[model samples]
Target: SMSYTWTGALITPCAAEESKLPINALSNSLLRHHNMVYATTSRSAGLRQKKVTFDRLQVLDDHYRDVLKEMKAKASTVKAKLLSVEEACKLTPPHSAKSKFGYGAKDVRNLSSKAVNHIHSVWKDLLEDTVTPIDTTIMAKNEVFCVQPEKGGRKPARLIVFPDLGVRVCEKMALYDVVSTLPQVVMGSSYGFQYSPGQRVEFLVNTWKSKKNPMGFSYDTRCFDSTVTENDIRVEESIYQCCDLAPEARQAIKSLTERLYIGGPLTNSKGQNCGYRRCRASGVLTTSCGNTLTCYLKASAACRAAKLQDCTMLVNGDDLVVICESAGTQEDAASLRVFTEAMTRYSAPPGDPPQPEYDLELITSCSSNVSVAHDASGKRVYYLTRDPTTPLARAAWETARHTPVNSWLGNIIMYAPTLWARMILMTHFFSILLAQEQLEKALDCQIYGACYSIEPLDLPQIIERLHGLSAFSLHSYSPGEINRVASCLRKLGVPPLRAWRHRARNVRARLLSRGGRAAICGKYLFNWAVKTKLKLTPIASWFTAGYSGGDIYH
Candidate 1:
C-alpha cells in the first residue's frame, strides 16, 4: 500500500487558544506551522488597502467618451435571450448549494417535480414584489494561497453570501447568457481566458510594440468585487436592458436587480440579522459580469482622461492591463498619476496604481506573471503562471473525495507545457485518477462557472486547445521551478515527481495495451512517450461539438 502525506510548509495562521472561532481545524493546524500569513494591520495589508480604497480627488475627461463609444458599439451587437426555466435548471450542478425550500438540485432538474413549480412561484414573486431586498446567508470560504513568505500565515477566510435557491434560478434566467457571451465579444482577444498562454504572450508583445514608445502596466483594484456600489449594480442592469430581451425577461431582470442585485441584507450564522449590504454580493451569477463591465467602463474612460497614447485594455473582472504610448518616462509617470485620479473619481481606484513598464513582459495580470524558463530539452519556454497554491489545495480535496473537476487537471490542461504544471500537477492528479480507475469517467470542470465534461481521453484535444501542438514535445523543466515544486510536494505530503513519472509510465503502458478510450488517453495525455509516437485519431464529432453528455451549458 502507498500513501501521500502533506506535512512540510503550513500556510495558515495559528488559532487563538482562548478564542472559539469556527475555523477549519485541518486548515488551521496545517497553517499554524507555516508563518507567512499577513496580519490585518500589517504594512503590506495597509498598502493593499490604500491601493483599493479611494478618499480624495475625482477627475473625468474625453477618454471616458472614447471608451464609452466602444462599449456602446459592443452593446449594440449583443442580443441577450432569456433562458427557459428548464434550460436554467439544467445549468444547476448536482452538487450546487442546496435550497432551504425543501428541494435540492436533483429535484430542480426534474421538470415534472414540485421543485419546478416552486421555482416558477419564486420567479413570479420576484416580478411582482419590488420593495424589500433579498436576505443572504453569509458563510466563510476556505481557500489556499501561494505563500508569500513576507506575507505569511493562514489566509483569511472569504465571506461568501449565499442567496436563496429560487432567486438563483431567476438570476440564471436573467444574466447567464449575458455573462457568458457579452464580455468576449466586447473585449475580443483581450478577454483573458479566451487565449492560450502562448497566444496571450504573443498578443501582448504585438500590442505593446504597436504603440510608439509603448507604456504598459496591470492595475489591481483592492477588493474589486466588494467595492462595487449600488450605483454600479444599477448600471449593470441598465446595460442588460440595452439588449432586446423578452418582456417577461426584462421585467424579471429589473425586479431581480432591485431585490437582490442592488443591495441585500445579511443573516449571519448565529441567526442574527446583520445590516444590509450596500456593496456587491460575492456569491451571485452577476458578480463576475458586473465587475468586468464596471472595470472596463471605468478603465476605458480613465485611460482617455489620462491621455495615454492609443490606449488598449485587456480586462478580466477587475484585473486590467493597459498598453498605450509612452510620452517619455517623466510624462508617462505624470499620465499614470492622472489616470489614477480619474479611476478614483470613477469609483474604481487601483490597489497598485499603474507603473509604466517598458516591456510588455513585465506586466502581470490575473495573478499570472509571464516568465521565461527552459524545458528538459533545454529550449527556452515562456508561459503565464502564478503560485501553485489553489491547484495544491484542490489536489488535496481530490485525494479524499474522488471527485471530478479537479483544479490540478484543469491547470495541467491549460499550462501543460509550464514546468511547474507539467512535472507536478500532471503527474500528481493523473496518478490519483489512475489509482481510482476513473480515467474513462466523464468528469465536470468549469471555467468562470460554465461546466464542461472532460474524459481522460479528452486531454489531448484540451491540451492542444490551450497549449498548442508543442505541448507533446515539452519534456524538461527549469531547475528553479522544479526545485520549488519538489519543496511544495514534500510539504503537501504528495509523492515526488519521480514517483509520478513512474506511475505515468505504467498508466501509459496499460492504456496503450487496452485500446479504445483507454488507448486514446494513453496517446494524448502521455504523448511525452520516449519510445514511440502514436498517431492521433480524430475524436467523434458528437464529443467535439454540440455534445452535451454531462455538459450543463447549452
Candidate 2:
C-alpha cells in the first residue's frame, strides 16, 4: 500500500472596525491562516502542479532575531556571576569531621569539575546556537502568512473581515504599559518598556500560521477601498483617516488612557454588560486561562477564486473581495468549473452585512469598562482588568510564559579562576562553604531553569511550594534575601546544612538530567521528515528502531 501526505496553506484577511484603523490594533483572536485545498480532476489519479505562494512576514522575522539576542545577553550576565560564586566557595577547606583530609579540597575538586563541565555546556550551547533552530522554524511558519494560486484563480483574493475587533489609539490604556510585553511589537504601545514616541500610532497587521497544524482555517482579514461611502460612519478629528476610529469611541478611549497613566482601574461601568467574563481558579486567584485565547487558520483556496479573471464578485467592500481558489490541475476544466460555480454561489457576504459594528461594540465596550477606574490619588486612572479569566488576561499570561533559559551565565563558573583558588586555600572551611554555596547555586538554577519551563509546568504546585518556604525564603531585596536564607541554613548547623545542600544538589542534578530526555523528545521531528525510511523496515527492524526512533538515516 502507498501512503500520502497532505499540506495546506491559507490567504487570511484582516480589518479594523473602523476602516482607518491600523491592522495591528485588532486582537490575535481575529487573525487566522486560511487553508488551501488541492483537488485533482480524477479521484483515482494523483496530480502535481506548481506550489502556491504565501506572503512572507518580514516584520516578525526581524523581531525574533532581536529578542533572542537580548535574552541571550541577559542570561549570560547572570550565569557568569553564579559560576564565579560557585568556584570561589569550592576552594574553601572541608570540616575535619566531614572529610578525610580535614579540609574541603575534595569538595572543591568536585565542584570545580562540575563548574568546568557547565562552562563547556554553555560554550557548546552558544557556539552551536540551537536557539536559532527554534527561531528559524518560527520564522518559516510566519513566512507564508497567506497563500494563493498564481494562475487560473479569481481576479484577487477576497478579504475576510472580523469587524468585532477595534483599536483605541490613545484610549483605554493599561497602567502596566511598562510591564506587558508582546511576542512582537504591537501598534499604539510604546516601543520599549518605557519611552514610547508620542505621535500618531500606526498599527501593523500581523498574520500567524500554525507550526504544528497548518491546514486549519480562520476568518480574520478585511479589505479596504475608497469606493465605500462614509455616510453611516462617524469620524473624529484627532484620529487621522489613516487611523480609523469613531469620534465617540475615541473619547471613551481617551478617558481610558488618561485614567491609566496617573492611576489605574477606574470604577464606573462594572454593572453594565462588560461583554466578556471568565471563571477563576478556586484556590489561587490566577485565572485558569491558557496561553492562547483563540486559534484561527484560513484557506488560501478562497484567495485563488477571487483572483481569477473570470471570477465574479460574490461579496465586495471598500477594498476587500472574497473568492475561492481552484485546487485541481489548471488543465482540468471540470474542477475549475465546479470551483468557479461554487465561488459565485457561496462566496458573497451573507444576508446580514459583515458585523463590523458588533465587533467594534465588543472591543470598545470591554475596553472602556476595564481601563477607566478611579485611583487612590483621586485622579482618573487606567488599569488592565484584573480578571484573570478574560481573553486579554489570558493573552498576557501566554506572553510571560516560555521565556527561554539563557545558558550563557554558566560561563561565570568557568571564568572565575579565583573562585577555585579561594576554595582551595580555605580547605578547613570546606564543609560550611560547600553547604552554603550549594544552597545558593541550587536556588539560582531552579529559578533560571524554571523561567523557560514555567509554561508547561504546574504553576500552582510550584507557587505553593514557594509559599510554604516563604518564612525562610526571601521574596524581595536580593542581597537581603540571600543573607536571610544563608542565616537560616547556618542556624541549622553542620549536619543539617550538609543534608540540605545534598538535597539541593540532588534536585539540580534531577533537573539537569532532563536535558537528555528533552533531546530525545525532539526526535519525533524525524517522523515528519524522512518518514518513508521508517515505514520501509520490517518487523525484525523494529528492535533496532526502538520506542525512541533509533538512528535511521535518510
Per-model lDDT: 0.64, 0.20
Decoy 1 TM-score against native: 0.80
Best by lDDT: 1
lDDT of 1 by residue, 100-131 (tens): 78887777777546788888898888778876
lDDT of each residue in 1-554, candidate 2, tens digit only: 00111232222212111111122211121111112211112111111111111111111123223433443343222210112323323322232012212223344345555434443343343333412211000000100111234545412321111100001111112101111222012111211111111110011000111111111111222211111111111111111112233443334333322221111111111112111101110111000000000000011233343233222111101112222232333423443343333322322122222211111112221111112222222443222111111221212222222212212121111111111111111111222223334212221211211111122112112322322211111112223323433443233221222333343333333333444422221121111112232221111110010000000111
- Can you give the lDDT of residue 246 in candidate 1? 82
Candidate 2: stretches off by over 4 Å: 1-112, 125-369, 375-379, 386-554
**Cα deviation in Å at residue 167, candidate 2?**
39
